[PDB]
Amino acid sequence: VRSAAVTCLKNILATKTGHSFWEIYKMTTDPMLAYLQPFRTSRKKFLEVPRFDKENPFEGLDDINLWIPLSENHDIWIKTLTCAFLDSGGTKCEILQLLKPMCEVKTDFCQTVLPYLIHDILLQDTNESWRNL
Amino acid sequence: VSETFGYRRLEDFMASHLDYLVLEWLNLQDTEYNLSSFPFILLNYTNIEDFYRSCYKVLIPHLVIRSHFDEVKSIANQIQEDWKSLLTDCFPKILVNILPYFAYEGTRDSGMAQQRETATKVYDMLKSENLLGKQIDHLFISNLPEIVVELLMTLHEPDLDPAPNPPHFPSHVIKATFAYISNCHKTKLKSILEILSKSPDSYQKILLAICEQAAETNNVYKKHRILKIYHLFVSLLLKDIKSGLGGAWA
């Protein structure tokens, strides 16, 4: 869990969104600023998250068995649902795509992050396809 | 015996002592007892190729420290991988058998001497253009943390306490090796932690590495050894607290 958290922190802080967040958050007096200082690095070029382009993104989520669990595999069900949401190219947020390694080690993180994934996918929806599905 | 000791699989139990096994097999120096003559059937490996692909990180350093380059070039040619990559993967494991001999009061003992010049020759022929000597400085300065982790893994203080893998040195030898590494730098920093502070995150990695060892063993003696290594590293960090670890103290 600690290794995944360190990797995710580095990847998030290496992006332009992390730099923008830091530019405002540096004013606040919070211990998180001191804790996250070593992982902050200065580089000429911001980290570029690859843009995943599927031929069809809907069939990955279009599965009844994927949504309804079996009442004894809640952890596996939520992990699979979050991984399926992340794998497709529906999401466009820079920081969300960097949260895959952390989602594979904690169920609570998947529960926390699923609503944001759904909101991000629905925000950029075209001609009400993702909405209907 | 493996299930009795609590190991999940026999492979972990045997790989724990594989270092000592390989070193003793090579030191036995019998012509009929070559690298291929080593019994890998005890390692659940059906063929020698899988044994190489699984334990290269251990096999190549021992051959390199005995100046056996045609064997490693062979293992490369039937391993389906370049020998340069195999050499650069096990660089800290080769280094821990070379660097400590330079910095500790040479010529005091005959065996430690002959070790110290044999490591000197190994380093010299490593510097050759055909080998990785062209970019050895960049590789040394690039990934420092696991070099420090591997060298710290060799700590052993000689009381009915089982010894670790054969390459092991006392604490003062380790500190001397740290000082030698610091002086070897072009800028010649006073301490190794000064050049470690150039990458503030590096410290974290080292700590995690030690913790990872404490995760993989349930033996009390091994846990105590890892605790001693952790104590030594934490004391070394605390010694130079005034300079600041590149803003990574909190």
Question: What would the two tokens of residue B164 be?
Answer: 């670790």
Question: Can you name the residues that pair with B169 across neighbouring β-strands?
Answer: B155
The CA distance from B54 to B59, in Å, is: 10
Question: What would the two tokens of residue B20 be?
Answer: 């000592």
Q: Which residue, B191, B102, B201, B194, is CA-closest to B145?
A: B201
DSSP A71: S
Residues 6+ away with beta carbon under 8 Å from A104: A4, A79, A83
To test the contact with chain B by mutation, choose from A2, A9, A10, A30 the residue with the greatest count of B C-beta atoms within 10 A, namely A2
Q: How was this structure determined?
A: cryo-EM
The CA distance from B41 to B206, in Å, is: 35
The CA distance from B78 to B76, in Å, is: 6
Distance from the Cα of residue B140 to its chain's centroid: 14
Question: What would the two tokens of residue A56 be?
Answer: 């069809």
The CA distance from B5 to B165, in Å, is: 18
Residue among B208, B211, B248 minimizing CB distance to A38? B248
Angle ∠(B19,B20,B25) on CA atoms, nearest 5 = 105
- Resolution in angstroms comes to 2.5
Whether the CB-CB separation of B237 and B245 falls below 8 Å is answered with yes
Nearest CA in chain B to A10: B201
Question: Are residues B204 and A6, on separate chains, in Cβ contact within 8 Å?
Answer: yes
Angle ∠(A41,A45,A50) on CA atoms, nearest 5 = 105
Q: How far is A79 from chain B (nearest CA, A)?
A: 25
Cα–Cα distances (Å) from A112 to A21, A43, A70, A99, in that order, read: 20, 31, 21, 12
CB pairs under 8 A between A and B: 22
User: Could you give the 3-state DSSP secondary structure of residue B19?
Assistant: helix
